[PDB]
Amino acid sequence: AAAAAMIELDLCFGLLLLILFGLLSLRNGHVSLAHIRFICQCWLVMITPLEVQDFALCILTVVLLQSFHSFEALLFLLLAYIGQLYMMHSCNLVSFYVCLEAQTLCVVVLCGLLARGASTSFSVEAALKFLLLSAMVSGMALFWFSAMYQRTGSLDMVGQETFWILLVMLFKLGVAPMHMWSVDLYGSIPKSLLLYLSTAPKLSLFTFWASSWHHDFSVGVFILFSMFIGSIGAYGQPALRSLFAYSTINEIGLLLLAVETAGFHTLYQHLGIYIITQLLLWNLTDKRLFALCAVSLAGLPPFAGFFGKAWIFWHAMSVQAFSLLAAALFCTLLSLVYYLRVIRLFWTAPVHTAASFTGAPNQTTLTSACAVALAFAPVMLVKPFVI
Amino acid sequence: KTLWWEPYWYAGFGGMGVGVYLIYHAKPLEALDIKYWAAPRAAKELETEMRMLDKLN
Amino acid sequence: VFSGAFNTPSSTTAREPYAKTKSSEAEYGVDTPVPASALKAADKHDALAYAVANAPLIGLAGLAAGAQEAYMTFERLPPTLSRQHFKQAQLLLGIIGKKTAYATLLGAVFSFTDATVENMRGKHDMTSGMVAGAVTGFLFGMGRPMPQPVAWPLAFAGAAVAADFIGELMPKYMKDYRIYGPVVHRENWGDPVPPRPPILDTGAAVRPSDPGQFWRGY
Amino acid sequence: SVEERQSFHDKVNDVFKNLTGEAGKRWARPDEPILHTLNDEKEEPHIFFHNTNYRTSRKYINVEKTKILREQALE
Amino acid sequence: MFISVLLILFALCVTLIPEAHYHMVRVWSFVATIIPMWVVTWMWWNFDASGHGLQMLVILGRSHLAFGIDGVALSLMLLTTVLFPICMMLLRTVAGFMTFILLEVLVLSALCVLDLLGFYILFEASLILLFLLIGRAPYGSLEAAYKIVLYTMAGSLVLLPTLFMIYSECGTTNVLYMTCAYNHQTVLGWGLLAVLAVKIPLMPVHLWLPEAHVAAPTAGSVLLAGVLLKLGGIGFLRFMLPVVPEFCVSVFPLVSTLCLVSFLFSTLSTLRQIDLKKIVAYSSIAHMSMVTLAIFSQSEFSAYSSSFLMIAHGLISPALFLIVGILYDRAHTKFILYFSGLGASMPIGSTLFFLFTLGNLAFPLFPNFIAEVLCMVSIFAVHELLAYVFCVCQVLGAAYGFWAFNRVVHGLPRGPADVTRTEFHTVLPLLIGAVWLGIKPMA
Amino acid sequence: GWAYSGEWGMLAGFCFGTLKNVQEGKAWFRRPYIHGAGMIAGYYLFKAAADWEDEALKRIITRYERKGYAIPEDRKELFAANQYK
Amino acid sequence: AYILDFLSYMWEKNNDDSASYKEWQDFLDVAEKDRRRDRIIAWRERTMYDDYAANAEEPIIYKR
Numbered sequence A: 001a002a003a004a005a006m007i008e009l010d011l012c013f014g015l016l017l018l019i020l021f022g023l024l025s026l027r028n029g030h031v032s033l034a035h036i037r038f039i040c041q042c043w044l045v046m047i048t049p050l051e052v053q054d055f056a057l058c059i060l061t062v063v064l065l066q067s068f069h070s071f072e073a074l075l076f077l078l079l080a081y082i083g084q085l086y087m088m089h090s091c092n093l094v095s096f097y098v099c100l101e102a103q104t105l106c107v108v109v110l111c112g113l114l115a116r117g118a119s120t121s122f123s124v125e126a127a128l129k130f131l132l133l134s135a136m137v138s139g140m141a142l143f144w145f146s147a148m149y150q151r152t153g154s155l156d157m158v159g160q161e162t163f164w165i166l167l168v169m170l171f172k173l174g175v176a177p178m179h180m181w182s183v184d185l186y187g188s189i190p191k192s193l194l195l196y197l198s199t200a201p202k203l204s205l206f207t208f209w210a211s212s213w214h215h216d217f218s219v220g221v222f223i224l225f226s227m228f229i230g231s232i233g234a235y236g237q238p239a240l241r242s243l244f245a246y247s248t249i250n251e252i253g254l255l256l257l258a259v260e261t262a263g264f265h266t267l268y269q270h271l272g273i274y275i276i277t278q279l280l281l282w283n284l285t286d287k288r289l290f291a292l293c294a295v296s297l298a299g300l301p302p303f304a305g306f307f308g309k310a311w312i313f314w315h316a317m318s319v320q321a322f323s324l325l326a327a328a329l330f331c332t333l334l335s336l337v338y339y340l341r342v343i344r345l346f347w348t349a350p351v352h353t354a355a356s357f358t359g360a361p362n363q364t365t366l367t368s369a370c371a372v373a374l375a376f377a378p379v380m381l382v383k384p385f386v387i
Numbered sequence B: 001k002t003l004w005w006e007p008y009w010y011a012g013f014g015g016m017g018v019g020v021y022l023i024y025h026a027k028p029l030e031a032l033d034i035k036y037w038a039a040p041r042a043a044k045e046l047e048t049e050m051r052m053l054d055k056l057n
Numbered sequence C: 001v002f003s004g005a006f007n008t009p010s011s012t013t014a015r016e017p018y019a020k021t022k023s024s025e026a027e028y029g030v031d032t033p034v035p036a037s038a039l040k041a042a043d044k045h046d047a048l049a050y051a052v053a054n055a056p057l058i059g060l061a062g063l064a065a066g067a068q069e070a071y072m073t074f075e076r077l078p079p080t081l082s083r084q085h086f087k088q089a090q091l092l093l094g095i096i097g098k099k100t101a102y103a104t105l106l107g108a109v110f111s112f113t114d115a116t117v118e119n120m121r122g123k124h125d126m127t128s129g130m131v132a133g134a135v136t137g138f139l140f141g142m143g144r145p146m147p148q149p150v151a152w153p154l155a156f157a158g159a160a161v162a163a164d165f166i167g168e169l170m171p172k173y174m175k176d177y178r179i180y181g182p183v184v185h186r187e188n189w190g191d192p193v194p195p196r197p198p199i200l201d202t203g204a205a206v207r208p209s210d211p212g213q214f215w216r217g218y
Numbered sequence D: 001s002v003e004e005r006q007s008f009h010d011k012v013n014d015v016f017k018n019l020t021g022e023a024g025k026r027w028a029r030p031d032e033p034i035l036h037t038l039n040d041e042k043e044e045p046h047i048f049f050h051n052t053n054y055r056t057s058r059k060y061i062n063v064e065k066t067k068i069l070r071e072q073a074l075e
Numbered sequence E: 001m002f003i004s005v006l007l008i009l010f011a012l013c014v015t016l017i018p019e020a021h022y023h024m025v026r027v028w029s030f031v032a033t034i035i036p037m038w039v040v041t042w043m044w045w046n047f048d049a050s051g052h053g054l055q056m057l058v059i060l061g062r063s064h065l066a067f068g069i070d071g072v073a074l075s076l077m078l079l080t081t082v083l084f085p086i087c088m089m090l091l092r093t094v095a096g097f098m099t100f101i102l103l104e105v106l107v108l109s110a111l112c113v114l115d116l117l118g119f120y121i122l123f124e125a126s127l128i129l130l131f132l133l134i135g136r137a138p139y140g141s142l143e144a145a146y147k148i149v150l151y152t153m154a155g156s157l158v159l160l161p162t163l164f165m166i167y168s169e170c171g172t173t174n175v176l177y178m179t180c181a182y183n184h185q186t187v188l189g190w191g192l193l194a195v196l197a198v199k200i201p202l203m204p205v206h207l208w209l210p211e212a213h214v215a216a217p218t219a220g221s222v223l224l225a226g227v228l229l230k231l232g233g234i235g236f237l238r239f240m241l242p243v244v245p246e247f248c249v250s251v252f253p254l255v256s257t258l259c260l261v262s263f264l265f266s267t268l269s270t271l272r273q274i275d276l277k278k279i280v281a282y283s284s285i286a287h288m289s290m291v292t293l294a295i296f297s298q299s300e301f302s303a304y305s306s307s308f309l310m311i312a313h314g315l316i317s318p319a320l321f322l323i324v325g326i327l328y329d330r331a332h333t334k335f336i337l338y339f340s341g342l343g344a345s346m347p348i349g350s351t352l353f354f355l356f357t358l359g360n361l362a363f364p365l366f367p368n369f370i371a372e373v374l375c376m377v378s379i380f381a382v383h384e385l386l387a388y389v390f391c392v393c394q395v396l397g398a399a400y401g402f403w404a405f406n407r408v409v410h411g412l413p414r415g416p417a418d419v420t421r422t423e424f425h426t427v428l429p430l431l432i433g434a435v436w437l438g439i440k441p442m443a
Numbered sequence F: 001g002w003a004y005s006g007e008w009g010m011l012a013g014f015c016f017g018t019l020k021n022v023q024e025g026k027a028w029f030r031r032p033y034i035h036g037a038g039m040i041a042g043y044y045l046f047k048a049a050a051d052w053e054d055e056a057l058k059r060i061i062t063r064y065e066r067k068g069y070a071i072p073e074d075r076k077e078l079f080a081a082n083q084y085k
Numbered sequence G: 001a002y003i004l005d006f007l008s009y010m011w012e013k014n015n016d017d018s019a020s021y022k023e024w025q026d027f028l029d030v031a032e033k034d035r036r037r038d039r040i041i042a043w044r045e046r047t048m049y050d051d052y053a054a055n056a057e058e059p060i061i062y063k064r
C-alpha cells in the first residue's frame, strides 16, 4: 500500500504543475514572478514534515526565496531544498551521497547563473574551482563507502572507514584546513547566494549528524585549525568579504567544539542565533545595523551571540575539555579586534542611505528590522529552552 | 539671568542634603546604627560581669 | 550574611574529612580502550625508550611545516627551473627533510631531558618539564641575536608548564567533580540519584578522567 | 548516614519555613544560637545564616562593652 | 523593581525629543539622573541597620538577575548617583547623554546584583560603550580604547569558564548557595582574581589605565576613576571572599606582594610624569593597592575600612580630574610646562586644587585620613611590617603631589581666568561630601 | 512560562516599528499601523516561546523518568507544571 | 524638633520586620527551586537519535 507516501506524490505533482505554470507565465512576457515565488513557498510548506528541525529549514528557505527573482533560480533552490530536507532523514551512505551531490550541483549552477557586471568571470572561476574540489571529495566518499560495503556486507556505518566519511562532512562545512573553497566563494559570488550558503546546508548536515551518525574518532585538530586560522585570517584580511569568510571558519570551529563534547543543545542554540544574524547581515541597507551584527558576533554580553557562545563554553567546561576550551577563549579574545574594526568602519561614520528610484523602496526592511530584535530573545535564551 | 541647570541643581542636591540630614537626625537610633541596639545590651551584661569579676578576686 | 565586621565563611569549616559521595546506582566506568602505542608512550622509566616513543610525533609537526614550505617554494619556480625534475626533487626534499629532522631532534631532546630529570630526582613534578623546556629552547635559540637565547627557553618552558597545569594537574584536582546527581558533600540537600552516569558520545579528545564523571560511548 | 542527614535537613527546612516572631523582636538579632553537631555548619544554610546573625550581634556587643569600660576607666 | 523600570523608561525618552528644542533636551537628561539620586537616598532612609545583612531583596525567577542591598553596595550606589549628574553637566550631545544613561543603568544594577552570571552579564556589557567613549574620533585615542577593552575582555574570558564550572558543580550561580556548597576553590579563585585584578589596577595588568583615564573626556574620567575601579573591590567583598575563602587565604602572599610592588612602583612612576592628567591618573593605582591589601587582610573591620577608602577616593580623585578638565577646556593643553602662576590668575580654582591635593595625600579633616588610618589598622593586625611599608613611603606621595601643585600654581602668572558658576557647581557637591565625611562621618 | 512575556513581546513590536521607520528615514511615530501589527506579532511569538518553556520541561521529566531516573514528588512539581512565574 | 520625632514614628510605623523575614524566605525558596531544577536537568545524556539502546524506552514509531 502506498497510502503512507502521499507527501512524495504531492512533491512530484507540485513540481510537474509548477514547471508548466512557469512556462505559461513566461509566454506572456512577465518581467516579474512574485506569483511563482508564492507557489514555491506554498510547495515548500506542503512537503515538510512536523519536526522542529524540518520546519526550521522550511521557514528559513521561505524567507530566503524573497531575494531571488528568476524562474530557474527558484527551481534550483527548490531542488536543493529536496536534498537538504532528505539528507536529514538519510540513514545510509547511498541517500547521503545523492543528497550531497544534488546540493553541490545546484550551488555550482546558481553561482554560474546569477553573476552580473564585471564580477561575472570571477564568480564563474570560483564556481569551477569549487566544482573541481567537490568532485574529488565525492570520489573519496564513494571509495571509502565501497570499502565499508565490502568489509561489512551491509549498509551499517561502523568501522575504520567512517573516519574518511567524517572528513567528507568536514569539507562540506568549510572546516579548516579544507576551508579555501568557501574563502574563494565569498570573494566573488553575489550576496544572496552567500546568504544561502552560510545558513541552510550547515543546518541540514548538522541535523544528519545529530540524527544518524557515530564515529570512534576525534575532530580536535580541525577545531584548533578552524579557530586559529579563522581568527588570524579575519584579523589580517582588509577586504570585508574575506573578513566574513574567516569569521565563519571561526564560528564553525566553535560549533565543532560543541559537537566534540556532545551536548547538541548548545550547538542548536548557537546555530540558530548565527543563522538569524546571517539573515540580518546579507540584507542590510542601513549601515548602522552592521554594528549590531558586530557586537552580536563578538559575543558581547547582553546580545544573543553571547548566550550562544556561552552555553558552548559551559558544556565544554562541564565535561572538562580544557585545552580546546582555552584555545577557544584565546580566539574569542582575538575576534573582538576585527569586530571592533567593523564598528569603527560603519558606526563612527556619517550616515548615507540612498533612496530607491525604480520602485521597491528599501524592500527588505521588514526582515532586517525583525532580525535586529535579537536583543529581546535573550530573555528566553537564559531559561532551559533549547533542550 | 538664571542658568538652565540652576533650579534643578539646587532642588536635586539640596533635597539630597536635607534627606541625608533627616537620615542622621530623624531615623530611630537602632535603625540608624547597630551600635545603638547593642549599647544597652552591653551595659546589663557588664553589670552582671563586674560582680562576677569581683567575686573571682 | 554581609557585614562590615567579618566574613563568616572564612572561619566556618568542616572538622572532619568527608566520606565518598555515591553518585549513581552503578559505580563502574564505561569507556573505549586506549591504543597500546600511547600506553607505551606514557612510560618514563626508560629514558631512551621514552624519547623513541615520543619524538616521531613531534617530528610530524616539522614534516607538516616542511611540506607547506616546499609546496609554496615549488609554486614560484620559473619553467626553466621547474622542468629539471631531479634538481626540483632534491630541493623540495631538502626543505622537507631539514624541517622533519630539526623537529625530531627537538622532540627527542625534550623527551630525553624530561625523563632523565624525572629519573634523577626520583619523583614526578613540574621541574623536569621546566628543565627540559629550558634545554630544548636553548637548543632552538642558539646562534641568534640577543633577546632570543633567553626568550626561547622561556617559551618552551612555558609550553611545558601550560601542559602540566591544563592537561595533568587540573584533571587530577577535579577527579571528584560531578555535574549530575547529589551535590558532593551535600547529600542532605536531597538531589536524586540517577541509575547511571550520563551517557555522552564525545570525541576522543574528551574522555572521562574518573569512572564516575560520565559514561562514554554510544 | 545520608538518610539521617536528609531527614534533619527536611526538619530544618520545615521549621524555618513556618517561623514567625513579633512584639519588639527583630529576627536576625536572635537571642540564642542553634546548637548542632554538624560537620561544616554550611551544610544547612538556615542554621548558617542564623548563627551568622548571632555572631554579628556578639561582635557589636563586645565593641560596646569596650566603650563603656573605657569611659569608666577614664573617670 | 517597578520603580527601576519607570526610571529606565523615563531616561530612555531623551532620544524621542526633537533636537531643535535644546533647553528641553538639557533639562530632561539632567533630571533623568537627578531622580535616581533621590531614590537611592530614600533607600538609605529605608535601611534597617540593626536588621539583616541583605535587605530589599528581589529575584527574577530562573533568569539569574537577583538583587539585594548591603552597606558596601549602598554606599557605592550613593556615590554613583552623585557622580552621574556632574557628568551630565559636562556633555553637550545626545550621544553623550545616552551613553552615560546606559552606563548608569549598568553600573547601578551591577553594584547590587547577587548572581555571578548576572554580575558578568551586567558589568562587561559596558565594554563597547567605553570603547566608543574613549576612542571618539577627533579628540580621543583609539589606542587607549583598544587597550582598556582588550585587558577587560582578557580577564572576563578567564573568569567565564570557572563561573560555569561552579554552576555545573552546585547547580546555581546565586551567591547565597555558592557560599554554602563544596566547590573546587583554586580554579574559581584564579578566575575571580583574573577579572578583579584587571578592574582594580594591580600590576602587571594595569597598563590600560594611564592611557584610558587620560584619553577619556572629563566626564568619562570622572566616571572611570570614581566608579568603575571600585567594581573590582565590590567584586572582592561580595563574590570572591564569601565563595572561595580557602583560596583567599592561600593566595595572600602573592596578592600581598602584588599590592606592595604596585604601590611602590606606581608611586615611583608618578614622580616622573609631565602631564597633569597622567599625574592624577597614576595616583589612583597606589590607593587601590591599599584598598586591595586592606580587603585581603580580613583582620579587624576590613570591609568597613576598605569601603570607606573606596568612597574617599571616589570623592577626591574626580575633583582633581574636574580641575584638570577645566584647565584643558579653557587652555587646550594638559602639559605642565605651559602652566605657571595659577594662584594669581585662578585663585578659586587654585584653592580648590590645594584642598583636593591635601585630600588626596590623606591629610586630616578629609575622609582619606580616616580611611588610611583604618586601612592600616586592618593591615597592622596581620603583621606590623606590612603596615610599615605603607607608613614609611608617605614622603613619596607628598613629593609628587606638592611638586605638581607648586609647579602649576606658583611662579609667573600665565594661564586662563578663574572658574565660572557652572565649573564651581560641578566641583561643589564633592567638596561638601568631603567636609562631612572627613569631620562627622558617623552618628 | 514567564508571566510577563506578552508585555516583552509588545515592547519588542514597538521597537521593531521604530527601527523600520528609522531605517527608511522616517521619525519614530510614523506609520503607527506598522507598530500595531508588530506588537500583535511580538505578543503572540513570545507567548508561544513561553508555552515552549513548559513543553520542554514536560519532555525532560517524561524522558528522564522513562529511563529509570526516579524523581521525588517534591521535585516533580518543578517540571510538570504550567508555572506562571 | 517635633518633625524629627514624627519622622521617627513614621519610620517605625512603615517598617515591618515579619514582612522582611518573609521576603528573605521567598528569596531563598525561589533560588533553591532554580538550583534543584537545574541540578536535575544536568543529567543530560547525548547520543544519536538512531541509538536504539540509549533510547530504548522512548515510544518511537518508524517509517522506513
Ligand SMILES: CCCCCCCCCCCCCCCCCC(=O)O[C@@H](COC(=O)CCCCCCCCCCCCCCC)COP(=O)(O)OCC[N+](C)(C)C
Binding pocket: B013, B014, B016, B017, B032, B033, B034, C001, C002, C003, C004, D056, E044, E047, E048, E049, E050, E051, E052, E053, E070, E071, E072, E074, E075, E076, E078, E079, E082, E303, E304, E307, E308, E311, E428, E429, E430, E432, E433, E434, E437, E441, E442, E443
Ligand atoms: C560595610 C559597612 C558599610 C560602610 C561603608 C563606608 C561608608 C562611607 C561613609 C561612612 C558613613 C558611616 C554611616 C553610619 C550610619 C549610616 C547608616 C548605617 O548604619 O550604615 C549603613 C550603610 O551606610 C551607608 O550607606 C553610608 C553612605 C555613605 C556614602 C556617602 C558618599 C555619598 C555622598 C556624596 C556627597 C554628597 C553631597 C551632596 C550635598 C550637596 C549600614 O552599615 P552597617 O551599620 O555596617 O550595617 C550593619 C550590618 N548589619 C545589617 C548586618 C547588622
